[model samples]
Target: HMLRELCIQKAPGEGLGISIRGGARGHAGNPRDPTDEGIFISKVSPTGAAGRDGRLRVGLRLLEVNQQSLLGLTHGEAVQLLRSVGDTLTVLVC
Candidate 1:
């Protein structure tokens, strides 16, 4: 499974809300240094919502969000879960 946080931004004149996504997956073996591991970001369609947000960048590994762990989810699962999260998502990377 994956752990993620979502941040919703809504303004009077601005669009409905913006969703920010972040998270990580779990590993059975010993965890390696962040640098040694590869950070992967799910690709967003050019005309998709994430693409419009400009936050879905490849090679970006989500280490944490709202101080919660995201270890055990596949790339696709993480993205799906994150997209379903509510607003006010916060993330941290190392």
Candidate 2:
């Protein structure tokens, strides 16, 4: 009922769709932020994601994802978590 209104508010043109290139350990993930830190954008795929309307950015520190925290997680772990998001992932940056 609460978020339902907001969800409807985001109906037609809402949310940025970005793809992350994640892999097995010791391989490659976006070179991450230094700390198991606060809010962050962490990484945004420039060529792949195609920020057409400019919804995503490198300077953004992710505060939440689907009402979940991205803090206290390693970069690799964070990458994997981020990858778990389905189509039209809901990420809120602060």
Candidate 3:
């Protein structure tokens, strides 16, 4: 298992060129393991910030943003976390 740190820069009102899926939804009673409950990159733009960065793709497990851990967050929460960011976005993936 290897890790990658992707640093992307987006413009104001622009996207990071990625889509996400999965989270701790409909399984609240189950174990909240990041490996199983974490969000994933479900889609990637062909010509956007993350796409041009050349380190992100679909089906990749999202681990963190900046220094904030993505573990234990719900789908909506994770989306919000990703949305509430500045121009610079740093993501950890595996």
Candidate 4:
């Protein structure tokens, strides 16, 4: 699939309404890259911010957060970056 952008709007304390994993070499959740060279969305909360926006989905590869590239980051690094986003988030995914 071609790369696409998703914008999620939420309150300061409300998360993006999704769970992410697979930023390591052996992560199995990413369909395209089983090695987890990049991050991927593992779950989407149906009633959460991203879900309400209706763009994100499970197994979609996460390429960037805001303007930061996620290419070779570790799982913890990706988590921290995602957590540091603002109320309005712009993400690039595939």
Each model's lDDT: 0.44, 0.44, 0.76, 0.79
lDDT per residue as tens, model 3, 1-94: 3788877888756667778987665645456543467678998887877888777888888988776788777767776766655787888888
Instruction: Give me the runs in candidate 2 sitting further than 4 Å from their true place.
Output: 1-36, 50-53
Of 2 and 4, the candidate ahead on lDDT is: 4
Per-prediction backbone clash count: 10, 6, 0, 0
Q: Give candidate 1's total backbone clashes.
A: 10
Question: Candidate 3 — which residues are off by over 4 angstroms?
Answer: 27-29, 32-35
Residue-pair clash count for candidate 4: 0
Model 1 Cα lDDT, one tens digit per residue, 1-94: 2444434332223321223343332474345643333334545455544455565455456665445445654545544444444434454433
> Rank by TM-score, descending?
3, 4, 2, 1
What would the TM-scores of all predictions be? 0.41, 0.49, 0.78, 0.77
Model 1 regions more than 4 Å off: 1-39, 65-67, 74-77, 87-94
Error of 1 at 40 (Å): 1.7
Off by over 4 Å in 4: 26-36
At residue 28, give the lDDT of candidate 1.
40
